[PDB]
Ligand binder design. Structure first.
Ligand SMILES: CC(C)c1noc(=O)[nH]1
Lengths: 257, 300
């Protein structure tokens, strides 16, 4: 059925599954025209297709040319996303094809189901998880490849860098969602946390800095502090006054819908 | 004008004949229905007084044979049978008519209701939906499932309605996923009309039969099929004008005949709201829109 808090460990079992997030497929700037009307200008977008067990990210770059002369773009974007996910599944060898595709937004269910009719044994599921994959474009190397694209492109990444050498998929996914939630909440504060120690760099072949295990604990703390600081600013709440279980139930009530 | 005698009425029962109904008491001297209008199908239907779960009936056409009703005390229901002996049938009908032991089909002269509800319904198409080739009449009841319901379990006792499924390979051409899902014209015009039904009259006959089985038997699968066949037309951008005008007449008379008290069980809010207010054809069903808004404004 729906993927929720109860069935979270299912994400890290040996059944191949992909999350699909279509938030960043159709991206626009809104501006005034010479006559004082309003117009949109599309910018390059992407489909965020992630295997949460392995960290493999299939980043399909959606070039603005896709939209040229098309109507009802927000509707078309869902069907283009479904078309590209179904093309990706067909491109993979049988043993690499997912058993399940979890969409982050319920509006993707019918488009994806209809594109995947030829795969009746691939389950298409929604989720009760509030996942911060919209913040993918706050990862500098992902934003860079999307904006530089002059044509449709697929780029493959491992969004966990080498973390799985040291931690489980469960912990890697938890770290990823915390980083993305922090970048979504306060991008500039999150980047300053990640980049402030100049002695810790990002490897050419990585997305995130090369933190030791102890440094990741500090960074994670600083991210949970950022999220709670911003919740306090938003709701006019004295954070200093909150208990440890109050704090738990805010940080992880924000990743349920 | 044709006649369906009854051997007797040993159990108290509500008898329907088309849109009419009357109550027969246990062992009442009731011997059938006369003056049945030639040129239409008909349905005789039953609901037992002592067990309202017994709800069943027979579609027939008096042009195709001489039919009577006999109670079977073993299977506990009124059965339609065909009398092969013309002389015997005539003598039985004459005796009963002379003794005034038949009710008369109570058709008002000005009243086209039954023609309006069965315009496209033919006995030969009924006998392909309800498969029992040894009889010229067709048994339907409240619990019979459809071929579609059975897929999602006795195949011999099933209603063989044409399967309509908006999220199926039949409905959606590879390469035209968005197009075919948002505009069902391909599925309606190429697959269903040109391919399966051959013409709009057969499609409307099945739609009308589904409605009548939903209304007279409370047959749930039939109600599903009726709504699916309305939705497939309303969800198509390209429909011949004759078909839209005819559908508006068909639906008007169905909504007119529906008992007010069954509107909560017989009408699907999502389909009707979509069809009248959201669909390609939201402005094509003026008569149906007006009767729905005046009779059932709570549904809308
Ligand atoms: C077979 C017999 C009982 C009969 N009764 O009415 C008929 O038309 N035939």
């Amino acid at each position: 059925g729906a993927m929720n808090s109860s069935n979270y460990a299912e994400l890290f079992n040996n059944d191949i599954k992909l999350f699909v997030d279509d938030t960043n497929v159709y991206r626009v700037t809104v501006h005034k025209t010479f006559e004082g009307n309003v117009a949109t200008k599309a910018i390059n977008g992407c489909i965020f297709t992630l295997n949460p067990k392995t960290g493999h990210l299939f980043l399909k770059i959606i070039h603005t040319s896709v939209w040229a002369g098309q109507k009802r773009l927000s509707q078309l974007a869902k069907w283009k996303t479904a078309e590209e996910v179904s093309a990706l599944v067909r491109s993979l060898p049988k043993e690499e094809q997912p058993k399940q595709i979890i969409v982050t937004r319920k509006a993707m269910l019918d488009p994806l189901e209809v594109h995947m009719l030829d795969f009746p044994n691939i389950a298409i599921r929604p989720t009760e998880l509030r996942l911060p994959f919209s913040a993918a474009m706050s990862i500098d190397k992902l934003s860079d490849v999307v904006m530089k694209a002059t044509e449709p492109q697929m780029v493959l990444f491992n969004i966990y860098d080498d973390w799985l050498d040291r931690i489980s998929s469960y912990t890697a996914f938890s770290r990823l969602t915390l980083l993305l939630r922090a970048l979504k909440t306060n991008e500039e504060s999150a980047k300053m946390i990640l980049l402030s120690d100049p002695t810790i760099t990002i490897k050419s072949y990585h997305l995130w800095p090369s933190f030791t295990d102890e440094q990741w604990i500090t960074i994670e703390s600083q991210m949970r502090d950022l999220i709670l600081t911003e919740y306090g600013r938003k709701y006019n709440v004295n954070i200093s006054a909150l208990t440890q279980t109050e704090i738990k139930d805010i940080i992880l009530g924000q990743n349920i819908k | 004008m044709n006649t369906v005698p009854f051997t007797s009425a040993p159990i108290e029962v509500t008898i329907g004949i088309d849109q009419y109904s009357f109550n027969v008491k246990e062992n009442q001297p009731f011997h059938g229905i006369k003056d049945i209008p030639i040129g239409h199908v008909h349905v005789i239907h039953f609901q037992h007084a002592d067990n309202s779960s017994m709800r069943y009936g027979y579609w027939f056409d008096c042009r195709m044979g001489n039919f009577y009703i006999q109670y079977d005390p073993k299977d506990g229901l009124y059965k339609m049978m065909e009398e092969r002996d013309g002389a015997k049938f005539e003598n039985i009908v004459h005796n009963f008519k002379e003794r005034q032991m038949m009710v008369s089909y109570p058709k008002i002269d000005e009243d086209d209701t039954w023609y309006n509800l069965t315009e496209f319904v033919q006995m030969d198409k009924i006998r392909k939906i309800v498969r029992k080739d040894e009889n010229q009449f067709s048994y339907v009841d409240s619990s019979m499932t459809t071929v579609q319901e059975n897929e999602l379990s006795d195949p011999a006792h099933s209603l063989n309605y044409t399967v309509i499924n908006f999220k199926s390979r039949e409905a959606i051409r590879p390469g035209h996923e968005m197009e075919d899902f948002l505009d069902k014209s391909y599925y309606l015009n190429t697959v269903m009309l040109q391919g399966i039904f051959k013409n709009s009259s057969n499609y409307f006959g099945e739609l009308q039969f589904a409605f009548l089985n939903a209304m007279f038997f409370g047959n749930y699968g039939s109600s599903l099929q009726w709504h699916a066949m309305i939705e497939l037309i309303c969800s198509s951008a390209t429909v011949p004008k004759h078909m839209l005008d005819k559908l508006d007449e068909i639906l008007y008379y169905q909504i007119k005949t529906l008992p007010e008290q069954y509107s909560d069980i017989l009408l699907n809010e999502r389909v009707w709201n979509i069809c009248l207010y959201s669909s390609f054809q939201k402005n094509s069903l003026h008569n149906t829109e007006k009767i729905m808004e005046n009779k059932y404004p709570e549904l809308l």
